[PDB]
Design a protein around this ligand. Structure first.
Ligand SMILES: O=C(O)[C@H]1O[C@@H](O)[C@H](O)[C@@H](O)[C@@H]1O
Ligand SMILES: [Mg+2]
Length: 301
């Protein structure tokens, strides 16, 4: 059948392109039985809404950010932990290894099959002034995703967090409802947030993954061969995504800079001040010995 899949991003964005690529591959692996259509631009709803729809089987699939599972799948909190990953190479090795697998496995009890992660770079604060330390965060109305952890992260940085859906952030910034948010460079560019919040400060406070989830209610009706085809197509989409994403990080940085944005390099941001402030949250959100073990497996990579 045609599986319906949700994404907040536009059609040309790397996540949408990767799932469309998966769909093309899936078609061939199933003798034309299956394909995927990606409804971008938050057409099917916010991330929160589309996750609830995937869980009841109203839509087949969604490519969403890991933060959107933080109140549903406890293990999803872990890779949103602040300053957990040293760098992108660390994220890749740990998240496409056994530790990442344990996180994927936890989705199944919550009515989702987590097929793969996709990298999402590092999230950084942007605003109408640069931010080198927490003092600089004070008084900023900072949009966050609707995640208790993300609320706590921004509060710990010194800002005042306000949860909002991704599609609404641009209007929020343009009209002063909020005056800052945080994200990777491709998202900063795609949404035009860089036009109204031109100071992008590389706090690199989180390296939250994307997750591609499939509705378990729909999954449970498929044969093992069909399931295996879907899993292979998802796995095969990752190097395709990585080529697009690495190129997009670079082109986004150049595009926003040419479009007037000022990037404060990570080296000039008081990483020390932010690590001080944010570090206790790990212990707050380790709600089981299994979560502690996953964190340890990531750190040991
Ligand atoms: O901040 C957000 O809501 C967005 O952040 C982006 O990095 C993720 O790609 C997107 O899935 C999230 O919806
Ligand atoms: Mg430990």
């Amino acid at each position: 059948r045609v599986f319906r899949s949700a994404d907040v991003h536009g059609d040309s964005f790397p996540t949408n392109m990767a799932v469309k690529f998966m769909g093309d591959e899936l078609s061939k692996l199933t003798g034309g039985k299956d394909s995927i259509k990606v409804f971008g631009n938050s057409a099917l709803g916010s991330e929160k809404d589309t996750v609830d729809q995937v869980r009841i089987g109203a839509i087949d699939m969604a490519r969403v950010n890991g933060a959107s599972f933080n109140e549903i799948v406890p293990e999803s909190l872990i890779p949103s932990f602040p300053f957990l990953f040293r760098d992108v190479d660390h994220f890749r090795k740990a998240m496409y290894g056994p530790a990442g697998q344990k996180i994927l496995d936890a989705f199944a009890a919550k009515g989702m099959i987590a097929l793969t992660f996709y990298e999402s770079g590092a999230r950084s604060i942007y605003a109408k002034r640069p931010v080198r330390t927490p003092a600089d965060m004070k008084g900023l109305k900072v949009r966050v995703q609707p995640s208790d952890l993300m609320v706590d992260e921004i509060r710990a940085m010194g800002g005042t967090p306000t949860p909002m859906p991704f599609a609404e952030v641009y209007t929020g910034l343009k009209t002063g409802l909020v005056d800052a948010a945080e994200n990777n460079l491709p998202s900063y560019e795609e949404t035009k947030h860089f036009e109204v919040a031109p100071d992008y400060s590389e706090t690199q406070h989180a390296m939250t993954p994307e997750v591609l989830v499939f509705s378990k209610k729909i999954w449970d009706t498929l044969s093992p061969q069909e399931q295996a085809a879907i899993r292979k197509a998802a796995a095969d989409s990752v190097p395709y995504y990585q080529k697009l994403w690495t190129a997009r990080e670079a082109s986004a940085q150049q595009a926003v800079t040419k479009g007037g944005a000022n990037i404060l390099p990570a080296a000039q941001v008081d990483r020390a001040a932010f690590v001080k402030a944010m570090q206790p949250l790990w212990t707050k959100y380790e709600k089981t010995p299994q979560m502690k073990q996953i964190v340890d497996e990531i750190e040991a990579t």
